[PDB]
Each structure stands twice: as C-alpha cells, then as structure tokens.
Amino acid sequence: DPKRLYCKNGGFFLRIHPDGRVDGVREKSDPHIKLQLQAEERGVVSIKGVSANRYLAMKEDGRLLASKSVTDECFFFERLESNNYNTYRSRKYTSWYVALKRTGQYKLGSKTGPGQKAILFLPMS
Ligand SMILES: CO[C@@H]1O[C@@H](C(=O)O)[C@@H](O[C@H]2O[C@H](COS(=O)(=O)O)[C@@H](O)[C@H](O)[C@H]2NS(=O)(=O)O)[C@H](O)[C@H]1OS(=O)(=O)O
C-alpha cells in the first residue's frame, strides 16, 4: 500500500515531481506525495513516486532527485528511531540522510546528521 512521508521538520510531505525534482509540500492531497516503499532486504528500501514513476536517489554530492532507473543510489536504510519517527539513510553514502528543510526545500545530504529534525519522517497511509 502507498505511503505519505510526513517530515517532522515543518510538517512537509516528501514530494517527487514527474520531472525528478524532490521537495516538500504541506498539502496532503498533492498528487506527487504518494510513495511506494519497497523492501529490497530487511531494513533496506527503495522509495518510488507513484505518480512520477521515479525512484528517490541520493547523489555523491548529497543531491536528492528521482531517477527513472533503479541504481545503487536508490537504496536507503529504513530505521525506526527511539522517538518513533523513521529515518532513511543512503545505503551508498552512509552518513547522509533523506531530509527536508523548514523552507520545504530538500536538505543536501552532506548537511544532515543523526540529531536533526530534518531527517525525521512518519509514514502515513
Ligand atoms: C527545531 O530544530 C531545528 O532548528 C530550527 C531552528 O533553529 O530554527 C530549524 O533550523 C533551520 O533554521 C535555522 C535558522 O535559520 S535562519 O534562516 O537563520 O533563521 C538554521 O540555522 C538551520 O540550519 C535550519 N535547519 S533546516 O533543516 O534547514 O530547516 C529546523 O527546524 C531544525 O533544524 S534541524 O537541522 O533540522 O535540526
């Protein structure tokens, strides 16, 4: 079943545009925030935009985008933290997290880390 990823940092839903752009939006009705999270192994997921047909990827410089193809940049550790929010940490760039800023823009992976509000998401159906 599809999920919406609600970010604790400002209450933005993770959004994947048809063109590959990634950002955040507060509108629960937005057509581009419905995501498919598929387990590739225990604790490892890909994140696909249902509307966009693109997979969330983190690049070597921390950029977030969504690609048509699934590559090693499209896998993330899904962890339930002690505060009961999930985090999604790049399987390839292992210190960097999927994250949204308070402005609704995505946060560059190299600017993220374990104590931040920006990396915390709650999956909702
Ligand atoms: C409440 O948790 C964090 O702190 C907030 C805050 O202190 O305002 C947010 O930080 C964001 O804004 C501050 C201040 O920016 S300003 O433009 O100078 O006002 C920045 O210093 C932070 O880098 C910003 N972080 S963000 O991830 O880009 O939003 C924010 O809610 C929380 O920051 S956190 O890094 O996610 O913990």
PDB file of all heavy atoms in Angstrom, residues 34-70:
ATOM      1  N   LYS A  34       2.335  10.619  -2.932  1.00  0.00           N
ATOM      2  CA  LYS A  34       2.046   9.223  -2.666  1.00  0.00           C
ATOM      3  C   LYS A  34       3.252   8.383  -3.085  1.00  0.00           C
ATOM      4  O   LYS A  34       3.654   8.411  -4.242  1.00  0.00           O
ATOM      5  CB  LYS A  34       0.782   8.805  -3.419  1.00  0.00           C
ATOM      6  CG  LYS A  34       0.164   7.533  -2.897  1.00  0.00           C
ATOM      7  CD  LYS A  34      -1.302   7.423  -3.288  1.00  0.00           C
ATOM      8  CE  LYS A  34      -2.126   8.467  -2.546  1.00  0.00           C
ATOM      9  NZ  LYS A  34      -3.128   9.120  -3.430  1.00  0.00           N
ATOM     10  N   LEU A  35       3.841   7.656  -2.141  1.00  0.00           N
ATOM     11  CA  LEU A  35       5.071   6.908  -2.408  1.00  0.00           C
ATOM     12  C   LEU A  35       4.903   5.392  -2.227  1.00  0.00           C
ATOM     13  O   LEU A  35       4.088   4.936  -1.423  1.00  0.00           O
ATOM     14  CB  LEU A  35       6.199   7.407  -1.491  1.00  0.00           C
ATOM     15  CG  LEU A  35       6.393   8.922  -1.370  1.00  0.00           C
ATOM     16  CD1 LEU A  35       7.446   9.250  -0.291  1.00  0.00           C
ATOM     17  CD2 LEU A  35       6.771   9.560  -2.707  1.00  0.00           C
ATOM     18  N   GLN A  36       5.675   4.615  -2.986  1.00  0.00           N
ATOM     19  CA  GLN A  36       5.740   3.179  -2.761  1.00  0.00           C
ATOM     20  C   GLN A  36       7.090   2.837  -2.154  1.00  0.00           C
ATOM     21  O   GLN A  36       8.138   3.062  -2.767  1.00  0.00           O
ATOM     22  CB  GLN A  36       5.525   2.394  -4.062  1.00  0.00           C
ATOM     23  CG  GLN A  36       5.548   0.883  -3.880  1.00  0.00           C
ATOM     24  CD  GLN A  36       4.478   0.377  -2.916  1.00  0.00           C
ATOM     25  OE1 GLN A  36       3.325   0.813  -2.962  1.00  0.00           O
ATOM     26  NE2 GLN A  36       4.859  -0.544  -2.037  1.00  0.00           N
ATOM     27  N   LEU A  37       7.066   2.314  -0.934  1.00  0.00           N
ATOM     28  CA  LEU A  37       8.292   1.909  -0.275  1.00  0.00           C
ATOM     29  C   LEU A  37       8.431   0.398  -0.367  1.00  0.00           C
ATOM     30  O   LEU A  37       7.634  -0.338   0.212  1.00  0.00           O
ATOM     31  CB  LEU A  37       8.294   2.349   1.184  1.00  0.00           C
ATOM     32  CG  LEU A  37       8.735   3.785   1.456  1.00  0.00           C
ATOM     33  CD1 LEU A  37       7.701   4.790   0.958  1.00  0.00           C
ATOM     34  CD2 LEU A  37       9.008   3.961   2.937  1.00  0.00           C
ATOM     35  N   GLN A  38       9.436  -0.060  -1.103  1.00  0.00           N
ATOM     36  CA  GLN A  38       9.609  -1.490  -1.327  1.00  0.00           C
ATOM     37  C   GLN A  38      10.883  -2.013  -0.680  1.00  0.00           C
ATOM     38  O   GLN A  38      11.973  -1.501  -0.933  1.00  0.00           O
ATOM     39  CB  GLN A  38       9.626  -1.804  -2.821  1.00  0.00           C
ATOM     40  CG  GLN A  38      10.187  -3.174  -3.154  1.00  0.00           C
ATOM     41  CD  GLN A  38       9.248  -4.297  -2.767  1.00  0.00           C
ATOM     42  OE1 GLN A  38       8.076  -4.061  -2.473  1.00  0.00           O
ATOM     43  NE2 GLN A  38       9.757  -5.531  -2.771  1.00  0.00           N
ATOM     44  N   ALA A  39      10.729  -3.047   0.142  1.00  0.00           N
ATOM     45  CA  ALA A  39      11.847  -3.661   0.843  1.00  0.00           C
ATOM     46  C   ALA A  39      12.707  -4.423  -0.142  1.00  0.00           C
ATOM     47  O   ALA A  39      12.205  -5.290  -0.852  1.00  0.00           O
ATOM     48  CB  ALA A  39      11.322  -4.618   1.899  1.00  0.00           C
ATOM     49  N   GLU A  40      13.998  -4.119  -0.198  1.00  0.00           N
ATOM     50  CA  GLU A  40      14.878  -4.926  -1.036  1.00  0.00           C
ATOM     51  C   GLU A  40      15.601  -5.996  -0.211  1.00  0.00           C
ATOM     52  O   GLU A  40      15.982  -7.036  -0.736  1.00  0.00           O
ATOM     53  CB  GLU A  40      15.829  -4.050  -1.870  1.00  0.00           C
ATOM     54  CG  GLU A  40      17.220  -3.842  -1.307  1.00  0.00           C
ATOM     55  CD  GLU A  40      18.184  -4.957  -1.673  1.00  0.00           C
ATOM     56  OE1 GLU A  40      18.469  -5.148  -2.876  1.00  0.00           O
ATOM     57  OE2 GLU A  40      18.659  -5.647  -0.749  1.00  0.00           O
ATOM     58  N   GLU A  41      15.774  -5.721   1.080  1.00  0.00           N
ATOM     59  CA  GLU A  41      16.297  -6.663   2.057  1.00  0.00           C
ATOM     60  C   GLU A  41      15.786  -6.140   3.389  1.00  0.00           C
ATOM     61  O   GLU A  41      15.291  -5.023   3.451  1.00  0.00           O
ATOM     62  CB  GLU A  41      17.825  -6.654   2.057  1.00  0.00           C
ATOM     63  CG  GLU A  41      18.461  -7.856   2.728  1.00  0.00           C
ATOM     64  CD  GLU A  41      19.854  -7.555   3.265  1.00  0.00           C
ATOM     65  OE1 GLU A  41      20.487  -6.596   2.770  1.00  0.00           O
ATOM     66  OE2 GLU A  41      20.313  -8.277   4.182  1.00  0.00           O
ATOM     67  N   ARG A  42      15.892  -6.929   4.452  1.00  0.00           N
ATOM     68  CA  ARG A  42      15.481  -6.456   5.770  1.00  0.00           C
ATOM     69  C   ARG A  42      16.099  -5.098   6.101  1.00  0.00           C
ATOM     70  O   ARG A  42      17.317  -4.968   6.161  1.00  0.00           O
ATOM     71  CB  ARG A  42      15.873  -7.464   6.847  1.00  0.00           C
ATOM     72  CG  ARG A  42      14.745  -8.373   7.296  1.00  0.00           C
ATOM     73  CD  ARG A  42      14.608  -8.340   8.811  1.00  0.00           C
ATOM     74  NE  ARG A  42      15.866  -8.643   9.487  1.00  0.00           N
ATOM     75  CZ  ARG A  42      16.163  -8.230  10.716  1.00  0.00           C
ATOM     76  NH1 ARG A  42      15.293  -7.493  11.392  1.00  0.00           N
ATOM     77  NH2 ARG A  42      17.328  -8.543  11.271  1.00  0.00           N
ATOM     78  N   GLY A  43      15.255  -4.088   6.290  1.00  0.00           N
ATOM     79  CA  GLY A  43      15.731  -2.776   6.702  1.00  0.00           C
ATOM     80  C   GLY A  43      16.246  -1.879   5.585  1.00  0.00           C
ATOM     81  O   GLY A  43      16.715  -0.765   5.842  1.00  0.00           O
ATOM     82  N   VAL A  44      16.158  -2.355   4.346  1.00  0.00           N
ATOM     83  CA  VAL A  44      16.618  -1.586   3.192  1.00  0.00           C
ATOM     84  C   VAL A  44      15.471  -1.394   2.203  1.00  0.00           C
ATOM     85  O   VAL A  44      14.852  -2.368   1.770  1.00  0.00           O
ATOM     86  CB  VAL A  44      17.775  -2.305   2.467  1.00  0.00           C
ATOM     87  CG1 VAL A  44      18.271  -1.465   1.267  1.00  0.00           C
ATOM     88  CG2 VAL A  44      18.908  -2.618   3.433  1.00  0.00           C
ATOM     89  N   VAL A  45      15.188  -0.145   1.839  1.00  0.00           N
ATOM     90  CA  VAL A  45      14.069   0.135   0.940  1.00  0.00           C
ATOM     91  C   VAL A  45      14.457   0.996  -0.257  1.00  0.00           C
ATOM     92  O   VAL A  45      15.454   1.707  -0.228  1.00  0.00           O
ATOM     93  CB  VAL A  45      12.907   0.849   1.681  1.00  0.00           C
ATOM     94  CG1 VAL A  45      12.389  -0.011   2.837  1.00  0.00           C
ATOM     95  CG2 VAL A  45      13.351   2.213   2.195  1.00  0.00           C
ATOM     96  N   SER A  46      13.665   0.901  -1.319  1.00  0.00           N
ATOM     97  CA  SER A  46      13.629   1.935  -2.348  1.00  0.00           C
ATOM     98  C   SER A  46      12.363   2.754  -2.113  1.00  0.00           C
ATOM     99  O   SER A  46      11.420   2.279  -1.481  1.00  0.00           O
ATOM    100  CB  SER A  46      13.653   1.335  -3.755  1.00  0.00           C
ATOM    101  OG  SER A  46      12.538   0.492  -3.985  1.00  0.00           O
ATOM    102  N   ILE A  47      12.361   3.993  -2.593  1.00  0.00           N
ATOM    103  CA  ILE A  47      11.234   4.909  -2.412  1.00  0.00           C
ATOM    104  C   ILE A  47      10.820   5.415  -3.791  1.00  0.00           C
ATOM    105  O   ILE A  47      11.547   6.190  -4.418  1.00  0.00           O
ATOM    106  CB  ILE A  47      11.620   6.085  -1.473  1.00  0.00           C
ATOM    107  CG1 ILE A  47      12.030   5.540  -0.106  1.00  0.00           C
ATOM    108  CG2 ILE A  47      10.468   7.059  -1.296  1.00  0.00           C
ATOM    109  CD1 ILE A  47      12.572   6.594   0.848  1.00  0.00           C
ATOM    110  N   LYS A  48       9.673   4.954  -4.277  1.00  0.00           N
ATOM    111  CA  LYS A  48       9.225   5.333  -5.617  1.00  0.00           C
ATOM    112  C   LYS A  48       8.019   6.276  -5.592  1.00  0.00           C
ATOM    113  O   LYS A  48       7.071   6.069  -4.835  1.00  0.00           O
ATOM    114  CB  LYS A  48       8.898   4.103  -6.462  1.00  0.00           C
ATOM    115  CG  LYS A  48       8.690   4.436  -7.954  1.00  0.00           C
ATOM    116  CD  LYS A  48       8.019   3.304  -8.731  1.00  0.00           C
ATOM    117  CE  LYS A  48       6.512   3.405  -8.619  1.00  0.00           C
ATOM    118  NZ  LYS A  48       5.802   2.391  -9.448  1.00  0.00           N
ATOM    119  N   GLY A  49       8.058   7.307  -6.431  1.00  0.00           N
ATOM    120  CA  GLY A  49       6.927   8.210  -6.569  1.00  0.00           C
ATOM    121  C   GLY A  49       5.869   7.505  -7.396  1.00  0.00           C
ATOM    122  O   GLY A  49       6.141   7.135  -8.531  1.00  0.00           O
ATOM    123  N   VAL A  50       4.681   7.307  -6.826  1.00  0.00           N
ATOM    124  CA  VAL A  50       3.589   6.616  -7.512  1.00  0.00           C
ATOM    125  C   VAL A  50       3.183   7.351  -8.793  1.00  0.00           C
ATOM    126  O   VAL A  50       3.047   6.750  -9.856  1.00  0.00           O
ATOM    127  CB  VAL A  50       2.362   6.437  -6.589  1.00  0.00           C
ATOM    128  CG1 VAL A  50       1.160   5.908  -7.391  1.00  0.00           C
ATOM    129  CG2 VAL A  50       2.683   5.491  -5.440  1.00  0.00           C
ATOM    130  N   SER A  51       3.010   8.661  -8.696  1.00  0.00           N
ATOM    131  CA  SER A  51       2.635   9.458  -9.855  1.00  0.00           C
ATOM    132  C   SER A  51       3.796   9.623 -10.835  1.00  0.00           C
ATOM    133  O   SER A  51       3.607   9.556 -12.050  1.00  0.00           O
ATOM    134  CB  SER A  51       2.108  10.822  -9.410  1.00  0.00           C
ATOM    135  OG  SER A  51       1.796  11.642 -10.515  1.00  0.00           O
ATOM    136  N   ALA A  52       4.997   9.816 -10.303  1.00  0.00           N
ATOM    137  CA  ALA A  52       6.165  10.140 -11.119  1.00  0.00           C
ATOM    138  C   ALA A  52       6.823   8.941 -11.798  1.00  0.00           C
ATOM    139  O   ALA A  52       7.498   9.108 -12.818  1.00  0.00           O
ATOM    140  CB  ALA A  52       7.200  10.901 -10.279  1.00  0.00           C
ATOM    141  N   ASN A  53       6.628   7.745 -11.240  1.00  0.00           N
ATOM    142  CA  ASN A  53       7.355   6.551 -11.680  1.00  0.00           C
ATOM    143  C   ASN A  53       8.855   6.765 -11.667  1.00  0.00           C
ATOM    144  O   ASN A  53       9.556   6.362 -12.582  1.00  0.00           O
ATOM    145  CB  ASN A  53       6.913   6.094 -13.071  1.00  0.00           C
ATOM    146  CG  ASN A  53       5.882   4.999 -13.020  1.00  0.00           C
ATOM    147  OD1 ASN A  53       5.828   4.220 -12.068  1.00  0.00           O
ATOM    148  ND2 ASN A  53       5.055   4.922 -14.059  1.00  0.00           N
ATOM    149  N   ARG A  54       9.346   7.407 -10.615  1.00  0.00           N
ATOM    150  CA  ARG A  54      10.769   7.647 -10.473  1.00  0.00           C
ATOM    151  C   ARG A  54      11.161   7.262  -9.058  1.00  0.00           C
ATOM    152  O   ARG A  54      10.339   7.339  -8.146  1.00  0.00           O
ATOM    153  CB  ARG A  54      11.092   9.119 -10.730  1.00  0.00           C
ATOM    154  CG  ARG A  54      10.658   9.598 -12.114  1.00  0.00           C
ATOM    155  CD  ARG A  54      11.044  11.044 -12.342  1.00  0.00           C
ATOM    156  NE  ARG A  54      12.472  11.150 -12.588  1.00  0.00           N
ATOM    157  CZ  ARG A  54      13.007  11.373 -13.781  1.00  0.00           C
ATOM    158  NH1 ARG A  54      12.228  11.547 -14.837  1.00  0.00           N
ATOM    159  NH2 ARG A  54      14.325  11.442 -13.911  1.00  0.00           N
ATOM    160  N   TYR A  55      12.410   6.847  -8.888  1.00  0.00           N
ATOM    161  CA  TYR A  55      12.887   6.358  -7.596  1.00  0.00           C
ATOM    162  C   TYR A  55      13.782   7.378  -6.952  1.00  0.00           C
ATOM    163  O   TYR A  55      14.678   7.927  -7.603  1.00  0.00           O
ATOM    164  CB  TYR A  55      13.666   5.061  -7.769  1.00  0.00           C
ATOM    165  CG  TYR A  55      12.828   3.966  -8.371  1.00  0.00           C
ATOM    166  CD1 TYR A  55      12.690   3.854  -9.750  1.00  0.00           C
ATOM    167  CD2 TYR A  55      12.148   3.069  -7.566  1.00  0.00           C
ATOM    168  CE1 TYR A  55      11.910   2.875 -10.307  1.00  0.00           C
ATOM    169  CE2 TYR A  55      11.365   2.074  -8.119  1.00  0.00           C
ATOM    170  CZ  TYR A  55      11.249   1.990  -9.490  1.00  0.00           C
ATOM    171  OH  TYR A  55      10.475   1.010 -10.060  1.00  0.00           O
ATOM    172  N   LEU A  56      13.556   7.619  -5.664  1.00  0.00           N
ATOM    173  CA  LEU A  56      14.369   8.575  -4.931  1.00  0.00           C
ATOM    174  C   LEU A  56      15.821   8.085  -4.934  1.00  0.00           C
ATOM    175  O   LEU A  56      16.088   6.901  -4.699  1.00  0.00           O
ATOM    176  CB  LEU A  56      13.833   8.727  -3.501  1.00  0.00           C
ATOM    177  CG  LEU A  56      14.444   9.816  -2.619  1.00  0.00           C
ATOM    178  CD1 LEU A  56      14.089  11.211  -3.131  1.00  0.00           C
ATOM    179  CD2 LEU A  56      14.004   9.635  -1.169  1.00  0.00           C
ATOM    180  N   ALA A  57      16.747   8.991  -5.228  1.00  0.00           N
ATOM    181  CA  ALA A  57      18.173   8.680  -5.244  1.00  0.00           C
ATOM    182  C   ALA A  57      18.962   9.783  -4.567  1.00  0.00           C
ATOM    183  O   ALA A  57      18.613  10.956  -4.672  1.00  0.00           O
ATOM    184  CB  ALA A  57      18.664   8.494  -6.671  1.00  0.00           C
ATOM    185  N   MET A  58      20.026   9.412  -3.868  1.00  0.00           N
ATOM    186  CA  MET A  58      20.941  10.418  -3.361  1.00  0.00           C
ATOM    187  C   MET A  58      22.256  10.338  -4.111  1.00  0.00           C
ATOM    188  O   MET A  58      22.820   9.260  -4.276  1.00  0.00           O
ATOM    189  CB  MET A  58      21.164  10.303  -1.852  1.00  0.00           C
ATOM    190  CG  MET A  58      21.909  11.520  -1.324  1.00  0.00           C
ATOM    191  SD  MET A  58      22.214  11.473   0.415  1.00  0.00           S
ATOM    192  CE  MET A  58      20.547  11.625   1.050  1.00  0.00           C
ATOM    193  N   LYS A  59      22.724  11.488  -4.581  1.00  0.00           N
ATOM    194  CA  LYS A  59      23.929  11.568  -5.399  1.00  0.00           C
ATOM    195  C   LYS A  59      25.188  11.712  -4.551  1.00  0.00           C
ATOM    196  O   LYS A  59      25.123  11.951  -3.345  1.00  0.00           O
ATOM    197  CB  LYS A  59      23.819  12.734  -6.388  1.00  0.00           C
ATOM    198  CG  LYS A  59      22.522  12.714  -7.198  1.00  0.00           C
ATOM    199  CD  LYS A  59      22.402  11.449  -8.020  1.00  0.00           C
ATOM    200  CE  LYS A  59      23.371  11.453  -9.194  1.00  0.00           C
ATOM    201  NZ  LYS A  59      23.269  10.189  -9.977  1.00  0.00           N
ATOM    202  N   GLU A  60      26.341  11.579  -5.196  1.00  0.00           N
ATOM    203  CA  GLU A  60      27.606  11.591  -4.482  1.00  0.00           C
ATOM    204  C   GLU A  60      27.927  12.914  -3.798  1.00  0.00           C
ATOM    205  O   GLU A  60      28.746  12.943  -2.882  1.00  0.00           O
ATOM    206  CB  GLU A  60      28.759  11.139  -5.385  1.00  0.00           C
ATOM    207  CG  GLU A  60      28.865  11.845  -6.719  1.00  0.00           C
ATOM    208  CD  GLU A  60      29.626  11.012  -7.744  1.00  0.00           C
ATOM    209  OE1 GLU A  60      30.800  10.667  -7.480  1.00  0.00           O
ATOM    210  OE2 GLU A  60      29.045  10.686  -8.803  1.00  0.00           O
ATOM    211  N   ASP A  61      27.287  14.000  -4.228  1.00  0.00           N
ATOM    212  CA  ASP A  61      27.466  15.276  -3.559  1.00  0.00           C
ATOM    213  C   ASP A  61      26.324  15.629  -2.608  1.00  0.00           C
ATOM    214  O   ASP A  61      26.255  16.746  -2.115  1.00  0.00           O
ATOM    215  CB  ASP A  61      27.699  16.408  -4.568  1.00  0.00           C
ATOM    216  CG  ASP A  61      26.580  16.530  -5.593  1.00  0.00           C
ATOM    217  OD1 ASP A  61      25.533  15.865  -5.430  1.00  0.00           O
ATOM    218  OD2 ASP A  61      26.756  17.309  -6.560  1.00  0.00           O
ATOM    219  N   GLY A  62      25.439  14.677  -2.339  1.00  0.00           N
ATOM    220  CA  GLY A  62      24.363  14.898  -1.385  1.00  0.00           C
ATOM    221  C   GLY A  62      23.069  15.380  -2.012  1.00  0.00           C
ATOM    222  O   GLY A  62      22.062  15.575  -1.332  1.00  0.00           O
ATOM    223  N   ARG A  63      23.082  15.580  -3.322  1.00  0.00           N
ATOM    224  CA  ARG A  63      21.861  15.989  -4.003  1.00  0.00           C
ATOM    225  C   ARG A  63      20.813  14.891  -3.945  1.00  0.00           C
ATOM    226  O   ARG A  63      21.131  13.703  -4.019  1.00  0.00           O
ATOM    227  CB  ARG A  63      22.137  16.353  -5.457  1.00  0.00           C
ATOM    228  CG  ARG A  63      22.843  17.668  -5.641  1.00  0.00           C
ATOM    229  CD  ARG A  63      23.630  17.681  -6.949  1.00  0.00           C
ATOM    230  NE  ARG A  63      22.828  17.253  -8.073  1.00  0.00           N
ATOM    231  CZ  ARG A  63      23.139  16.257  -8.897  1.00  0.00           C
ATOM    232  NH1 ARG A  63      24.254  15.549  -8.743  1.00  0.00           N
ATOM    233  NH2 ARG A  63      22.319  15.978  -9.884  1.00  0.00           N
ATOM    234  N   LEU A  64      19.564  15.312  -3.791  1.00  0.00           N
ATOM    235  CA  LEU A  64      18.423  14.421  -3.841  1.00  0.00           C
ATOM    236  C   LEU A  64      17.688  14.669  -5.159  1.00  0.00           C
ATOM    237  O   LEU A  64      17.508  15.813  -5.574  1.00  0.00           O
ATOM    238  CB  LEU A  64      17.511  14.727  -2.649  1.00  0.00           C
ATOM    239  CG  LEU A  64      16.863  13.605  -1.854  1.00  0.00           C
ATOM    240  CD1 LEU A  64      17.891  12.573  -1.411  1.00  0.00           C
ATOM    241  CD2 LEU A  64      16.117  14.196  -0.665  1.00  0.00           C
ATOM    242  N   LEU A  65      17.289  13.594  -5.828  1.00  0.00           N
ATOM    243  CA  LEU A  65      16.497  13.665  -7.050  1.00  0.00           C
ATOM    244  C   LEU A  65      15.795  12.319  -7.230  1.00  0.00           C
ATOM    245  O   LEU A  65      16.004  11.398  -6.429  1.00  0.00           O
ATOM    246  CB  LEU A  65      17.384  13.976  -8.259  1.00  0.00           C
ATOM    247  CG  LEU A  65      18.727  13.255  -8.439  1.00  0.00           C
ATOM    248  CD1 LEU A  65      18.587  11.773  -8.759  1.00  0.00           C
ATOM    249  CD2 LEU A  65      19.525  13.953  -9.530  1.00  0.00           C
ATOM    250  N   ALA A  66      14.980  12.183  -8.265  1.00  0.00           N
ATOM    251  CA  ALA A  66      14.378  10.883  -8.526  1.00  0.00           C
ATOM    252  C   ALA A  66      14.594  10.427  -9.963  1.00  0.00           C
ATOM    253  O   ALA A  66      14.276  11.147 -10.914  1.00  0.00           O
ATOM    254  CB  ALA A  66      12.910  10.888  -8.161  1.00  0.00           C
ATOM    255  N   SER A  67      15.132   9.220 -10.113  1.00  0.00           N
ATOM    256  CA  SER A  67      15.518   8.691 -11.421  1.00  0.00           C
ATOM    257  C   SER A  67      14.541   7.660 -11.989  1.00  0.00           C
ATOM    258  O   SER A  67      13.848   6.961 -11.248  1.00  0.00           O
ATOM    259  CB  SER A  67      16.890   8.037 -11.306  1.00  0.00           C
ATOM    260  OG  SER A  67      16.818   6.938 -10.424  1.00  0.00           O
ATOM    261  N   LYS A  68      14.501   7.547 -13.316  1.00  0.00           N
ATOM    262  CA  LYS A  68      13.652   6.546 -13.952  1.00  0.00           C
ATOM    263  C   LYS A  68      14.165   5.141 -13.678  1.00  0.00           C
ATOM    264  O   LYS A  68      13.384   4.195 -13.555  1.00  0.00           O
ATOM    265  CB  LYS A  68      13.569   6.774 -15.463  1.00  0.00           C
ATOM    266  CG  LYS A  68      12.798   8.009 -15.867  1.00  0.00           C
ATOM    267  CD  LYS A  68      12.750   8.136 -17.388  1.00  0.00           C
ATOM    268  CE  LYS A  68      14.138   8.368 -17.983  1.00  0.00           C
ATOM    269  NZ  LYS A  68      14.720   9.689 -17.586  1.00  0.00           N
ATOM    270  N   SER A  69      15.483   5.008 -13.585  1.00  0.00           N
ATOM    271  CA  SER A  69      16.096   3.710 -13.338  1.00  0.00           C
ATOM    272  C   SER A  69      16.487   3.523 -11.876  1.00  0.00           C
ATOM    273  O   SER A  69      16.780   4.487 -11.165  1.00  0.00           O
ATOM    274  CB  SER A  69      17.325   3.524 -14.227  1.00  0.00           C
ATOM    275  OG  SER A  69      17.010   3.781 -15.585  1.00  0.00           O
ATOM    276  N   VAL A  70      16.478   2.271 -11.439  1.00  0.00           N
ATOM    277  CA  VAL A  70      16.922   1.913 -10.105  1.00  0.00           C
ATOM    278  C   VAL A  70      18.404   1.590 -10.151  1.00  0.00           C
ATOM    279  O   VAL A  70      18.820   0.674 -10.859  1.00  0.00           O
ATOM    280  CB  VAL A  70      16.182   0.678  -9.579  1.00  0.00           C
ATOM    281  CG1 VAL A  70      16.679   0.317  -8.186  1.00  0.00           C
ATOM    282  CG2 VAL A  70      14.684   0.927  -9.571  1.00  0.00           C
TER     283      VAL A  70
END
